[PDB]
Structure 1
Amino acid sequence: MEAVLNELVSVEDLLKFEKKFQSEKAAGSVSKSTQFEYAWCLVRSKYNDDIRKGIVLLEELLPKGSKEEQRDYVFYLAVGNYRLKEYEKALKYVRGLLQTEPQNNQAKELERLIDKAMKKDGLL
């Protein structure tokens, strides 16, 4: 998607699932899917506080996931940590995922981005 469209869809997404998350948490407890969707929107946000919150929400889901869900959670932990420039954490997550999903070229392109960013720092 072009940039302006991507940004406005991102905002609409985040606001919808924030409402849903805040509604459910007001009504007692938050379903696993609602927490994941909100966290997924948070790690794509333009605000760093949002990304940090999405990471926390993904860490809370991680021990309760099926094996397939845990793979999805680790993907977005690497995304969030990469966007925060927590490169060594992101790199550890995506390498672990690639061991169990070797043909995941999305995870591979993410690893390439993380490596490229660690090179331009000089920290690789």
Structure 2
Amino acid sequence: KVDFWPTLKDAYEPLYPQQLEILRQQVVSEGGPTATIQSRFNYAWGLIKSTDVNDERLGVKILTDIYKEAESRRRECLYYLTIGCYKLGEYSMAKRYVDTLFEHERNNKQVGALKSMVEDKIQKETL
């Protein structure tokens, strides 16, 4: 019975390389750069969900491409990008994004959770 918004912990457990590959194979077939937003994301997610820095970097890149392309999906993307940047440790960027996401849906419990959790890492590396 899984949510509209993925938990940050969710973003931390990877996929079995089999599963990550499946997602790719699927994006391959939809046609890399012509593939559906969904299947392209769902691969990006898996990438960010992975624990290889390079995989993640694609994950963000994938997501930022999605963000560029689908105005509807932009609102959502800021959130994954925010996860993505945090996971990747480009924290400021994540504050940037999450702050944007924050205006649109301010009251969202997770948007809050994420903003808040992005911020700690901001101060704690200001120590």
Q: What TM-score bracket applies, with the shorter chain setting the length?
A: 0.7 to 0.9
Alignment of 1:71 onto 2:100: no
TM-score (norm 1): 0.82
Q: Where does residue 101 of structure 1 map in the other structure?
A: 105
Q: Where does residue 21 of structure 1 map in the other structure?
A: 27
* Aligned counterpart in structure 1 of residue 41 of structure 2, from 32, 36, 45: 36
Specify the SS of the correspondent of 2:34: coil
Higher normalized contact order (CA 8 Å, seq sep 6+, divided by chain length) = 2
Q: Percent identity?
A: 28
Specify the SS of the correspondent of 1:117: helix
Q: Where does residue 5 of structure 2 map in the other structure?
A: none
**How many residues are matched?**
116
Q: Which moved more, 1:72-81 or 1:15-24?
A: 15-24
Q: 1:56-95 to 2 correspondence within 5 Å? A: 56-67=61-72, 69-95=73-99
Give the aligned CA root-mean-square deviation in angstroms.
2.2
Distance 1:55 1:100 in 2: 21
Q: Describe the superposition over 1:52-101 as per-residue Cα deviations: whole angstroms up to 9, x where unpaired.
A: 0011111111122133x111111101100011111110001011001000
Distance 1:46 1:63 in 2: 25
> Which segments of 5 or more consecutive residues in structure 2 lack a partner in the other structure?
1-8
Report the structure, 1 or 2, having the larger helix content: 1
TM-score (norm 2): 0.80
Specify the SS of the correspondent of 1:103: coil
Matched letter for residue 70 of structure 2? G
Aligned structure 1 segments of 4 or more residues deviating by more than 3 angstroms: none
Higher CA-based Rg? 1
